[PDB]
């Protein structure tokens, strides 16, 4: 395909070229309709600066870079790739997963003094929410929350997920915002600022921690030392630091696609009206009429030591979708005599 | 057709040319009678600056730009296009949707200090109201409201929609009004001000959020730094910032057309007088005598976790329009024996 990759050089030409190649590959995969979950495993094998790349067992086979330019101080890379969009996979027949973006906090407010970027966590969780909402393939964002999610309180995680109707809750801590000064006699000072982050995803059905990853990137701080920067403004997010943080958010989305996309989606029972039950997933999540679903009885217990545990009882109950709304759906129980055993909170999975 | 597109250059000639092309295309589609809902999906494929554009499955097939001029500092584009106005579609046989423009707020009053444009949200919601009223094809504006609509209180949304007689409520938050300074030694300073906005549309029948989009544009701030600008005046709206905000409002209208226009319109039962019921839609909404309508029994519940849900019971009741007023209509129930089961709040849909 014909794609362009744009990335600014911070300290190494190799890193900027690799970032531009990643951007071009991401655009090519998005246009080709291929899954973006598989991209996050291709990057490690892209550390080398070889003109030709060979891969096996992937939707992309050979990568050939034809043009590399450093116009306006940032590397531009033009490549041609062959993408094979597979019609099958463990991610195409699943309903969309609702995700709640939790509180992202700055561990050390001391590091945010330069620029007074103290609301960077909130304005970055907003970016992560919008990235998951309008860029992901298998995720739906149900908003942000002001509460902090911890692994010590699975019950609170379950309650907050129930309140917001979220299958997973994602929250992080920003651990490094410090900067160093590089000085040259010919020119002015260069301030390279750090952005480290540790993201954690919790399963709202049982309170377990299902995802855990750490990110660290560096970018130039173009603003003055004594200048105050607003994190909601376009001045912050159009700068080199802003571009780096946007790339970090994209990597978060790609990692979530890589890890959670092929987990089987489990819509929950919202209400039971005799022989008809209601599902928390609807038309906007990919539900189509005539779908057959299998019911699981949910029983998740905190064990004797306070650690969350999971236990599902298999059921002989199968349901079919009768009416579909934008955000909910109605299902009819195919075994009327077993309809009395369905309670609120039981989960279902689509029969393939 | 023969159309002209006018757009001022802010930072890139490509953006100004694209905006002029969008303006010319919008005027051509409006004159041709084609639906304006389909325009909002054509813009993404217009990023390239190709002299010729090829499209499939659209009311416009080929676009050829013949004249491009930069007179008086703004790009003028003259094009010829072939538009095929389809007589069919999911948007031509539906009644008009009544929409209430909610409160639009400035999240950070700090950003509105320059020019003291603190009532920009209200005077922009007025523009959105007038744009939906006198420019849209499938919307009727029932005015503005001073209340804020949130996803946490579906009951309040339903009550406000009932009070104003609105099917949908649209409200937003203005998130960025900051500006940067570009300085040249030859000339004076250039102040480029930002305008970011997040619009949200709620369904008044059930309190659900049906639409969510974010807008961000930049334009020159021609006024002095210490000058106070009145947002109700023509000085504000005839400036470059005002033209940008008007274009943003037009994009809001086009996105609403793209998303909500083909939703089936559901007029509500206002009063029941024996065998005759009253409809909240009338002559001004497209109701014609002899129309056949199908009744749905409405039952929308808040579930155990406080989240809104929808549930409609299908009915064997069909109604026909007997007398038409400008704002209401009278319907006769075709099944007199079932007339006792019609209650206020039941919805109807036109039988096609």
């Amino acid at each position: 395909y014909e794609v362009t990759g744009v990335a600014t050089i911070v300290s190494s030409e190799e890193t900027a070229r690799l970032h531009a190649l990643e951007d071009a590959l991401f655009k090519a995969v998005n246009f080709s309709g291929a899954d973006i979950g598989s991209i996050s495993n291709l990057m490690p094998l892209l550390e080398e600066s070889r003109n030709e790349y060979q891969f096996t067992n992937h939707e992309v086979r050979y990568i050939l870079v034809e043009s590399e330019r450093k116009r306006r101080g940032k590397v531009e890379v033009k490549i041609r790739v062959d993408i094979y969009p597979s019609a099958t996979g463990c991610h195409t027949d699943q309903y969309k997963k609702t995700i709640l973006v939790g509180n992202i906090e700055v561990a050390s407010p001391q590091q945010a003094v330069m620029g007074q970027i103290y609301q960077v966590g909130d304005d970055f969780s907003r970016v992560v929410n919008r990235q998951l909402d309008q860029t992901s393939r298998s995720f739906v964002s149900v908003g942000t929350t002001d509460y902090s999610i911890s692994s010590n309180y699975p019950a609170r995680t379950q309650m907050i997920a129930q309140d917001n109707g979220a299958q997973y809750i994602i929250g992080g801590v920003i651990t490094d915002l410090t900067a160093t000064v590089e000085s040259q006699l010919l020119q002015d000072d260069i301030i390279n600022r750090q952005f480290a982050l540790e993201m954690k995803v919790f399963d709202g059905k049982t309170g377990h921690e299902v995802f855990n990853k750490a990110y660290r990137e560096v970018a130039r701080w173009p603003f003055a030392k004594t200048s105050q920067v607003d994190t909601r403004s376009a001045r912050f997010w159009a700068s080199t630091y802003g571009e780096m943080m946007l790339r970090v958010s994209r990597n978060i989305m790609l990692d979530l696609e890589s890890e959670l996309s092929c987990k089987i989606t489990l819509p929950e029972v919202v209400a039971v009206f005799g022989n008809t039950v209601t599902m928390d997933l609807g038309r906007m999540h990919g539900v189509k009429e005539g779908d057959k679903l299998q019911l699981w009885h949910t029983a998740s217990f905190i064990d004797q030591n306070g650690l969350p545990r999971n236990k599902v009882s298999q059921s002989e109950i199968t349901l079919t979708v009768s009416r579909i709304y934008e955000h909910e759906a109605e299902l009819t129980i195919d075994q009327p005599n077993l309809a009395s055993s369905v309670q609120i909170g039981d989960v279902m999975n689509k029969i393939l | 057709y023969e159309v002209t597109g006018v757009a001022t250059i802010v930072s890139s000639e490509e953006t100004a040319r694209l905006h002029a092309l969008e303006d010319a295309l919008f005027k051509a589609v409006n004159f041709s009678g084609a639906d304006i809902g389909s325009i909002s999906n054509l813009m993404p494929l217009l990023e390239e600056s190709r002299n010729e554009y090829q499209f499939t499955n659209h009311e416009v097939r080929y676009i050829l730009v013949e004249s491009e001029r930069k007179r008086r500092g703004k790009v003028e584009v003259k094009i010829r296009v072939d538009i095929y106005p389809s007589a069919t579609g999911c948007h031509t046989d539906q009644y008009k949707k009544t929409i209430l423009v909610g409160n639009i707020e400035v999240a950070s009053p700090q950003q509105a200090v320059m020019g003291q444009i603190y009532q920009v949200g209200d005077d922009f919601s007025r523009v959105v109201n007038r744009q939906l009223d006198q420019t849209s094809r499938s919307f009727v504006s029932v005015g503005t409201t001073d209340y804020s609509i949130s996803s946490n209180y579906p009951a309040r949304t339903q009550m406000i929609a009932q009070d104003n007689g609105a099917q949908y409520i649209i409200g937003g938050v203005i998130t960025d009004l900051t500006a940067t300074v570009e300085s040249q030694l030859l000339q004076d300073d250039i102040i480029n001000r930002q305008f970011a906005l997040e619009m949200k549309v709620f369904d008044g029948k059930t309190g659900h959020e049906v639409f969510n989009k974010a807008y961000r544009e930049v334009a020159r701030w021609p006024f002095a730094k210490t000058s106070q600008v009145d947002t109700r005046s023509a000085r504000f709206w005839a400036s470059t910032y005002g033209e940008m905000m008007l274009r943003v409002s037009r994009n809001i209208m086009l996105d609403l057309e793209s998303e909500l226009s083909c939703k089936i319109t559901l007029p509500e039962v206002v009063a029941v007088f024996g065998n005759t019921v009253t409809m909240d839609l009338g002559r001004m909404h497209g109701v014609k005598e002899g129309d056949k309508l199908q009744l749905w029994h409405t039952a929308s519940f808040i579930d155990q976790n406080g989240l809104p849900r929808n549930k409609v019971s299908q009915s064997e009741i069909t109604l026909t329009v007997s007398r038409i007023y400008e704002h209401e209509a009278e319907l006769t129930i075709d099944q007199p024996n079932l007339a006792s089961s019609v209650q206020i709040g039941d919805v109807m849909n036109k039988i096609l």
């Binding site: 395909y1 014909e2 794609v3 362009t4 655009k27 090519a28 246009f31 080709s32 304005d123 907003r126 970016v127 919008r130 990235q131 309008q134 860029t135 909601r232 403004s233 376009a234 912050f236 997010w237 159009a238 802003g242 946007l246 958010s249 | 813009m43 993404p44 494929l45 217009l46 990023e47 390239e48 960025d176 930002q194 970011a196 989009k213 974010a214 807008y215 961000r216």
Partner: peptide
């Protein structure tokens, strides 16, 4: 083929 380059809605800016 030839992938397009149309921009989309900004995530924050």
């Amino acid at each position: 083929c030839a992938m397009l380059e149309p921009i989309e809605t900004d995530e924050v800016t």
